[PDB]
Design a protein around this nucleic acid. Structure first.
Ligand SMILES: [Mn+2]
Ligand SMILES: [Mn+2]
Length: 566
RNA sequence: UUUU
């Protein structure tokens, strides 16, 4: 069947769409070559559509049918609870889209009458109406990247399809738990979203060490969400239905499956009819959990067919990275070839063909890889990195365009040990932040999907609990990692690394001098900027009131919000 | 204007 069906009515905006980096006297401090930057807009959505729209052929062999049965048996283990409206409302991000029915995120979190009195009517319908497709909206997401080295190759806008605010709250009421528990339950260590970046690195290594002669690789299917067949979605529901649900829970899951998840009509920001979606909806709660299981399923099934000795895979939504036992160069090469032939048969073609790798630091998945460096005492230390182009790109864009969701903060947390995040991001912003003095001002960034309100003043404690004290003392970085950073810098036109120690030494001492948590930031977050690094003892609060549940499971697109870690 |  066709992933989508268009009518002519267009994907339209509802706000002003910039798409160039304004000559921000501060952006020039973080990035000279402004040009190198841009932000997707509506004007390039159709290109996205054409890319996205295609026919789907899928066939199900035995391996698939068996693997699935297995997953269901683990699923049978889980038990999910229904969620109270209060519980769902409070999970709604403070800035989520408002409802056509005259009420928004704020009215919800505060449990307005007009709000709940809708969520309630919405949840009743989900029990009274079992066939009617449910209306979804289609927007183009605003996204900033760096101009492709092909001077002109710009990424077309991404697309987001989400159901009304009321339908989203009910989703949480019926699946939140399922989605927060069931995945792991089914996939064991294969579930990516359960690790912090250091647990991921750790896992990736032990695993790579567990093979006599390891061979790893990753597989990136093309436009995953469109490759998802209404069959794929129905199967996912079979998995969900193995949990021990409450009838209204169980029934809602049913209703949403046929009414929202398998597909439905598309409306634009202006009430116009855009057409039909018959593939995964990018903006649903089940979006991630559904992708993780499908990638997992189809891959574990492809592995058997292709015959890869001792496969240990790591799934993260449509993101996949499998490590196994090598059988020979000319052997592995063909083996993987069979793997892509199976995956494809399952309606999961690759963007680029997968390539077997024999270096762990070379395998890259989820636009990041495993590199090495050294801690204080110099004991080798693994940390998870990535190419900083986008991150630096996005950060300069935000510096000039106060953005709703600060990708920079998110980067800092996740990649805290990276050379680029310590010397360039942390510096650039704490200078900004400290010049306006907004250290208490809690901004929003996001992790594995869900949103999070954090106070920059707590990075110290948060950074340690996720990376350890090594996060604040890594020095011998790998030559290759170093060149990757250096180069990106040159590209965007950013001043060499050694030049930031100076910009730091200061900002770091203007915090030292503010005492308190501020002074704590200055001590740990900038110890690399002093010609005399001082020893760092564990942070008291850090490991103490470490409010968690952070890396338990993905929710990208789910509209999930949590405000813990001060 | 919503956060795959
Ligand atoms: Mn894709
Ligand atoms: Mn990806």
């Amino acid at each position: 069947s066709m992933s989508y069906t268009w009518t002519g009515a267009l994907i339209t905006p509802c706000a002003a769409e910039e798409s160039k980096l304004p000559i921000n006297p501060l952006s020039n401090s973080l990035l000279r070559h402004h040009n190198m930057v841009y932000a997707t807009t509506s004007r390039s959505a159709s290109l996205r559509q054409k890319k996205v729209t295609f026919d789907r052929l899928q066939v199900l062999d035995d391996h698939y049918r068996d693997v699935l049965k297995e997953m269901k048996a683990k699923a049978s283990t889980v038990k999910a609870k229904l969620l109270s409206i209060e519980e769902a409302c409070k999970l709604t991000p403070p800035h989520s889209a408002k409802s056509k029915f005259g009420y928004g995120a704020k009215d919800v979190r505060n449990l307005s009458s007009r709000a709940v009195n809708h969520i309630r009517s919405v949840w009743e319908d989900l029990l009274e109406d079992t066939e009617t497709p449910i209306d979804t909206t289609i927007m183009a997401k605003s996204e900033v990247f760096c101009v492709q080295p092909e001077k002109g190759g710009r990424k077309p806008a991404r697309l987001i399809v989400f159901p009304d605010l009321g339908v989203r709250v009910c989703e949480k009421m019926a699946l939140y738990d399922v989605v927060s528990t069931l995945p792991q339950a089914v996939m064991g260590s294969s579930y990516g979203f359960q690790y912090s970046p250091k647990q991921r690195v750790e896992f990736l290594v032990n695993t790579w060490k567990s093979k006599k002669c390891p061979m790893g690789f990753s597989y990136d299917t093309r436009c995953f969400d469109s490759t998802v067949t209404e069959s794929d979605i129905r199967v996912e529901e079979s998995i969900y239905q193995c949990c021990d649900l409450a009838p209204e829970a169980r029934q809602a899951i049913r209703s949403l499956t046929e009414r929202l998840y398998i597909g439905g009509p598309l409306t634009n920001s202006k009430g116009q009819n855009c057409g039909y979606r018959r593939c995964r909806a990018s903006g649903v709660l089940t979006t991630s959990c559904g992708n993780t299981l499908t990638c997992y399923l189809k891959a574990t099934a492809a592995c058997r067919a292709a015959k890869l000795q001792d496969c240990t895979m790591l799934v993260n939504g449509d993101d996949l990275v499998v490590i196994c036992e090598s059988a020979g160069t000319q052997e592995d090469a063909a083996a993987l070839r069979a793997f892509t032939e199976a995956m494809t048969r399952y309606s999961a073609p690759p963007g680029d063909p997968p390539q077997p790798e024999y270096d762990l630091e070379l395998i890259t998945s989820c636009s990041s890889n495993v590199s090495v460096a050294h801690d204080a005492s110099g004991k080798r230390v693994y940390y998870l990195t990535r190419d900083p182009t986008t991150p630096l790109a996005r950060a300069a864009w935000e510096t000039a365009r106060h953005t709703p969701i600060n990708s920079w903060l998110g980067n800092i947390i996740m990649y805290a040990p990276t050379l680029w995040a310590r010397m360039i991001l942390m510096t650039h912003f704490f200078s900004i932040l400290l010049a306006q003095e907004q250290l208490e001002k809690a901004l929003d960034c996001q992790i594995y999907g869900a949103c999070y309100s954090i106070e920059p003043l707590d990075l110290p404690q948060i950074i340690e609990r996720l990376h350890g004290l090594s996060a604040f003392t890594l020095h011998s970085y790998s030559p290759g990692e170093i060149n990757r950073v250096a180069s990106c810098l040159r590209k965007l036109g950013v001043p060499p690394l050694r030049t930031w120690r100076h910009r730091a030494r200061s900002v770091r001492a203007k915090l030292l001098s503010q005492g308190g948590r501020a002074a704590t930031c200055g001590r740990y977050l900038f110890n690399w900027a002093v010609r005399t690094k001082l020893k760092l003892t564990p942070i008291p609060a850090a490991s103490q009131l470490d409010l968690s549940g952070w890396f338990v499971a993905g929710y990208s697109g789910g509209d999930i919000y949590h405000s813990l870690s001060r």
